[PDB]
Each structure stands twice: as C-alpha cells, then as structure tokens.
C-alpha cells in the first residue's frame, strides 16, 4: 500500500523532477516509514520489552529473578556440570523461570515467545572445573530484532559476555 501510494504520488510529481515538492515528499516518506517501523517493532515485537528482559537477564536487572535462578541452580553450580546431558539443566532453567516473577511473562502469549527466544546453551569453560565456572549463557537473536538489538555475537567484542561474567563472579 505504501509503495502504491507513493508511486502514484511520484507519477503525479514526475513533471517536476528534482524540486522542493520532491524533497518534501522524500521527507514525509522517511518520517512515515520510520514511525511505522518504530510502531511495528514496539507493538508486534515489543522492542522495549525485549530490551528490558535482556537488561534483567543478562545485565541482572531483576535481582529477584537472579536470586531465584541462583537458589534453583545452587546444587548445579555446586556439583561439576562439565559432563552432563544438559537436559536436566534445561528443566531446572524452565522450573526457575516458572518459579520466578517471570511466570506472568510465561503466561502471556507474546512474552512466552520472547522468553523461549532465549537459547538454553551452556559453553563448557574449563576441564573438570566447578559447575559455576563451567556454566555459560548463550543467546541467539532472530529477525527483525537481530537487526536492532546487539548480543554476544561470535564476531563481536563480547560486551554482554564479559559483563555477565563480572556480575556472575560478584
């Protein structure tokens, strides 16, 4: 619809070419498409909600949720989890998500998908080390949120990774 509208607009404005009418039509098109992209990313994908969820999970913004995860996986962090099938780890993660205040988001349909977007992958760091040290959080993005938000990309600087490691030590 946008393409057809601005196509008939430029067809009516073809007799002028490069002019103030062309410039103002370009400006209006840019403003409208930017507002539409913002509205779509905020409503259909909840850009700000995903940003808040990332700040609460990776940056440990939700102290209650972090403490719930810690008390749920305390035995896992205690025992060496370097050699485990990780299915029990995923089950413990799901149980902690259910028990924490994020149960509201889990019940919510869209926020359920937002939570499921988190990948339950653990990168083994150390040979026979403690479970706390061998535990690692790996997040994978998906469009159209990948083109906006930044995560621990394999070719990046691991900003979120080092911040999460620092907060994890603390």
């Amino acid at each position: 619809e946008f393409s057809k509208k601005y196509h008939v607009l430029y067809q009516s404005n073809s007799y002028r070419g490069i002019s103030t009418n062309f410039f103002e039509i370009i400006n209006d098109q840019y403003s409208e498409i930017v507002n539409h992209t913002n509205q779509i990313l905020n409503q259909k994908f909840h850009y700000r909600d995903v940003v808040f969820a990332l700040k609460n999970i990776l940056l440990m913004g939700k102290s209650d949720f972090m403490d719930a995860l810690i008390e749920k996986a305390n035995d896992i962090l205690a025992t060496p989890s370097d050699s485990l099938p990780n299915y029990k780890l995923t089950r413990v993660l799901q149980e902690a998500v259910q028990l924490s205040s994020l149960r509201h988001l889990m019940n919510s349909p869209r926020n359920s998908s937002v939570i499921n977007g988190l990948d339950a992958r653990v990168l083994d760091l150390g040979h026979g080390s403690v479970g706390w040290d061998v535990f690692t959080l790996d997040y994978i993005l998906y469009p159209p949120l990948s083109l906006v938000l930044n995560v621990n990309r394999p070719f990046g600087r691991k900003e979120y990774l080092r911040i999460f490691n620092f907060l994890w030590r603390f």
Binding site: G61, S63, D67, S108
Partner: protein, 453 residues
C-alpha cells in the same frame, strides 16, 4: 535466596495488626476485602509478587499465607465478617477454650502447649501447601499475657521444628502499663524466649505511637485500630523489599544480613516519615520536603516508633529504604550530611546502608511534596532502657513476690519456688543481654579477639 513468609497472628493486638496489614496489602495489590483480586486475571503482568504472601488457589482469588491464633473468638469472628472470603477459615485457631483466665504469660503458655498439636498440624498443612519457604513472622503482642505465652510457645516449637528457617518477631510494648508488675513479668518471660530462639526481634513502643497518632492526626483521641494501623504500615513498608523486589534487597535473609551483626544483638529500632496511606493523610502536601529532608526526618528522634532517649547513642547497623522517585545526588548529599552527624563506633568502619524501592502502580499517586517516603531500621542499644524500666520494676517488686497466685496455675510448675526460680533465671538472662549490649557499645567488644588469637 528468596522464600515465602507465613504470617502468625497471635492475641487480640496481633490479630488486629495482621488484619490491618492484610487490608493494606489488599489495597496496594488491588485485592480488596473479598479475597478476589480487584484486577482481572487476564492482566497477569504484575511488577509485584503476591506469591510470598498470597496463595493463589483460583485465577482471581489470593488467599493470604497467614494463620490467626487467639483465645477470644469474638475478634476472630469480627475479622472474618469484615473480610468476607478474604481470610481462610481453616487457619483460625480458637481451641474453644473460652476467654483468657487472666493476663498471665503462664496461661498463654499452657493454652499453647495443650493445643500444640492443632497449631502444629495447621503449620504443617500451610507448609505442605507451598514449596519455597524461608521463615515465619510472629506478632508477639507482649502487652497481653495470653498472647505473649502463645507466642513463646509458638517460638519454642518452631525453633526445634524448623531450625533451617529464619524467625522474625514483632513485640509491641505499651507506653504506660496498667498492671505494671504483671505486664513486666509477661514481657520478661517473652524476651527470655526471644533471646533463646528468636533470630530477629523488632520492638514497638506505644509512647511514640501515641505521640505520632496525636501529632499527624487531627482527632486528639487515639484509637487502637488506627494505632495498629501504623504498625501494619511499618510491616508493609519493611516487607515491600520482597513484595515489590528492588535491585539490591530482595530477600528477608539478605535484609537481615546487614542488620544482625551477631545473634546476640537482634533488636532494632524503627523510624518512618509522616505516613501517606493512613486515615488522615491529607496534611502531607504542605511540608514540601525532599530526599535530604526525608533522611533527616528518618534520623530524627521524633519520627522513631520507639522511645529514643538518645544520650549519645551508639549505632551498629543503620539501614534505610526509600520508596518513590529518589535522586542519587540527593542520596549522596544526605549520606555526606549524616556521616558528619551520626555517632559511629571507632572499632567498626561500617557506615549506613541505603536502598531504593519501587512504588506500586495502583496506589493513589501523591503530590510532589510527599510522593517519596522512607523507612529506617537502626541497631541502637537504646532499647536496653525500655528493658531497664521493666527490670527495675522486677527488682523493686520481686523482693516480696506479688501476684504469684496467677503464674502458678496453667504452667508446668504449680509451686511458688519453681516460679520464683524461673523469674530469677529470666532476670539473669535479661541482665546478661543488657550487659552484652553495653559491652558491644564499647570498643573492647572487637578487641576481645584482638587481645587473644
């Protein structure tokens, strides 16, 4: 480290405080007096967490995780009639034992020991109905003998029933006791078990309560309901750190870590700014205060809920929680101003702690004058004076042995000599507590480990 907390209402004053606290939480979380949440169950997104305090049976009903235990069924029936369906009728204990036969601590202890099976079964059922548990919150109400005895029996059962749970107690002390001897006996017999088993204890002196209720309210006459309203608001403010979890303090154990330096020192002193959720709260938008003024009022003796009697008070652990739109620059300014005005011990360099909470999105928004409130909890040895009043009464009356014909019945000791020995042991233990407090007030308390390694 966050677990659910079960409320224990005991005695008439304790039941009133619990009812007021549950009404305040219902008003905050939009639950009402009907038990059914006023908010629709479709908007599940809640910034707060009613699970540690409200058991969710149905999608719209939230039963509070509380148990009431009293000897007078009249107050229980009145509370149940006022809160239709809000409370659980199975969590109400009366034992059909009739009215209390006096205001003696032994009567309450006996009525607790006899029906210990029912209350223990109810506690076991309440624990089985949940998964994550952290500890109980007991309302002692030491002013009443039967209530103090019931609380002491509950503590003496819970200490050896669940040693892995942290126990907090709230002891309400009256301003002027009617029967000074009996009330001092009951308070000392309660503080004995408080020192023995209770992990944390918060005192509430009624003198400052009456002062605040006469100052901030317009009516000169003070009523017990709006007096306990202050204590319930205090309890809701101190449980806010778990209800609406902040970013620094989100667990009762985490809160008590920075407040209890040693199991011997487990007595705190509260303070609160002019309230805003009470009955007469319209005279708050004319003070025109900021975060610094809120901190000054919190540190002022006129806003404390206990008799200060500040004569160079030695502070051990001072903590504050500010709810509202707080400014970090104003927080730092208040900290800089208080570090040059609060007496600090030379043996410990630990300073005061500041925490910032969140306001409820459904509470009535206040103007920019009192939109931000604060609560303060300080470890001061000024409570040893409130205890010294009672110990001096004990020392001046125990030389004769008055009112001994009331504490002899009910308890496990029917002779006078056994009761005298028990009261002497209670006096000795409170004297040792006061001595430990006055020793920790000095620098030699830390030097005890420096001079001997």
């Amino acid at each position: 480290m966050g677990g659910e907390i079960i409320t224990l209402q005991a005695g008439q004053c304790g039941n009133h405080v619990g009812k007021f606290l549950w009404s305040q939480l219902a008003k905050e979380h939009a639950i009402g007096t009907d038990g059914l949440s006023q908010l629709p169950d479709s908007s599940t997104e809640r910034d707060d967490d009613t699970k540690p305090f409200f058991r969710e049976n149905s999608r719209n009903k939230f039963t509070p995780r509380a148990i009431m235990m009293d000897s007078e069924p009249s107050v229980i029936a009145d509370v149940e009639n006022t809160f239709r369906g809000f409370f659980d009728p199975r969590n109400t204990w009366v034992a059909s034992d009739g009215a209390s036969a006096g205001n003696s601590w032994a009567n309450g202890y006996d009525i607790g020991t006899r029906n210990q099976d029912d209350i223990l079964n109810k506690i076991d059922k309440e624990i089985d109905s949940t998964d994550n548990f952290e500890g109980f919150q007991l309302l002692h109400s030491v002013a009443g003998g039967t209530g103090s005895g019931l609380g002491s029996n509950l503590l003496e059962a819970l200490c050896d029933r669940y040693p892995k749970k942290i126990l907090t107690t709230y002891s309400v002390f009256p301003a002027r006791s009617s029967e000074v001897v009996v009330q001092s006996y009951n308070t000392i017999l309660a503080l004995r078990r408080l020192i023995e088993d209770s992990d944390a204890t918060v005192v509430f002196d009624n003198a400052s309560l009456l002062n605040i209720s006469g100052k901030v309210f317009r009516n000169p006459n003070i009523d017990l309901q709006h007096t306990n309203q202050l204590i319930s608001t205090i309890i809701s403010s101190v449980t806010n750190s778990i209800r609406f979890p902040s970013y620094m303090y989100s667990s009762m154990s985490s809160i008590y870590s920075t407040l209890i330096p040693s199991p011997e020192l487990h007595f705190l002193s509260p303070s609160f700014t002019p309230f805003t959720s009470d009955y007469i709260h319209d005279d708050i938008a004319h003070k025109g205060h900021s975060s610094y003024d809120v901190m000054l009022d919190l540190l002022d003796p006129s806003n404390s809920l206990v008799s200060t009697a500040m004569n160079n008070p030695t502070y051990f652990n001072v903590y504050n929680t500010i709810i509202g739109n707080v400014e970090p620059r104003q927080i730092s300014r208040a900290m800089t101003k208080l570090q040059q005005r609060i007496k600090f011990p030379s043996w410990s360099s630990s300073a005061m702690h500041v925490n910032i909470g969140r306001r409820s999105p459904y509470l009535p928004l206040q103007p920019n004058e009192n939109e931000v409130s604060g609560m303060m909890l300080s470890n001061m040895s000024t409570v040893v004076n409130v205890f010294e009043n009672a110990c001096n009464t004990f020392d001046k009356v125990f030389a004769k042995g008055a009112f001994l014909n009331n504490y002899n019945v009910g308890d496990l000791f029917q002779s006078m000599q056994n009761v005298q020995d028990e009261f002497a042991e209670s006096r000795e233990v409170v004297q040792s507590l006061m001595e430990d407090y006055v020793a920790a007030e000095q620098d030699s308390y830390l030097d005890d480990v420096l001079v001997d390694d």
